[PDB]
Design a binder for this molecule. Structure first.
Ligand code: 2YP
Ligand code: NA
Length: 237
């Protein structure tokens, strides 16, 4: 079944592992579908779903890689660590610009927030390729400055009911907005309705694997004082 939700569900129980893209050496396309975090999960699922079926069945491994590269890197060009779309605002913009994402909250929510993005250059010790690369830090600062100050639409968490909203659909990509200083998004997953509740399929660092949430997305948001709302994105084909 070639849809976002069904391809997400195929990842249930896959282990959560941090830093799977961060091997020593040059930035190259890393494919690790057996160990994921919240972002790489969404990237693999989107890449698979974008890839057409072969006349034989299943998909071309090179086509999958090529599509993953378009999702993960700025205009699909691999050119050092800083070419990876580290910030989700930037990742969203890349998908919108290149025609494979649309911004659903931009079409449905009257609420906006102004981006203020500086986390990585402020905390370079947290990133292997920043911790001892002054050049990469300077490059990231320019990217951060380019992103910061723009307004984006979002759904404040108080406005998300347990039963979701009718314009949020199964398979939508959910990006959780955050009050962490200098950071736009803290977590991601895939929308899934069950028992008239909007749940999230996501790579859970707490449960150490990909799960369906046991409570609605609304409750996930309410329970976390750093989480402020969501952006809702949708694959476009
Ligand atoms: C800004 C940032 O940290 N970007 C990284 C991203 O973090 C994610 C991180 O979420 C983690 C994985 C989680 O919630 O378990 C979050 N980063 C921080 C600093 O909270 C944020 O939300 C999605 C994305 O940015 O991860 C990518 C894949 O490994 C990395 O390529 C990318 O560098
Ligand atoms: Na923030």
């Amino acid at each position: 079944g070639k849809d976002m939700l069904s391809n997400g569900i195929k990842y249930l129980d896959v282990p959560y592992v941090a830093h799977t893209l961060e091997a020593d050496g040059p930035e190259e396309l890393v494919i690790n579908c057996d160990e994921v975090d919240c972002t790489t999960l969404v990237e693999y699922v989107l890449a698979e779903t974008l890839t057409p079926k072969l006349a034989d069945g299943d998909i071309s491994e090179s086509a999958f890689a090529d599509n993953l590269q378009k999702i993960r890197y700025r205009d699909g060009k691999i050119d050092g660590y800083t070419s990876r779309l580290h910030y989700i605002a930037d990742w969203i913009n890349n998908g919108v610009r290149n025609g494979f994402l649309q911004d659903v909250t931009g079409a449905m929510s009257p609420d906006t927030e102004r981006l203020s993005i500086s986390y990585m250059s402020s905390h370079p010790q947290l990133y292997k390729q920043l911790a001892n690369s002054p050049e990469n830090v300077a490059k990231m600062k320019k990217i951060e400055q380019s992103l910061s100050g723009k307004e984006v639409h979002y759904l404040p968490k108080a406005k998300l009911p347990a039963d979701g909203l009718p314009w949020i659909k199964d398979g939508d990509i959910i990006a959780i907005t955050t009050n962490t200083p200098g950071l736009d998004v803290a977590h991601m997953g895939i929308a899934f309705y069950a028992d008239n509740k909007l749940l999230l399929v996501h790579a859970s660092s707490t449960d150490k694997k990909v799960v369906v949430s046991k409570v609605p997305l609304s409750q996930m948001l309410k329970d976390n004082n750093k989480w402020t709302g969501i952006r809702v994105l949708r694959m476009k084909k």
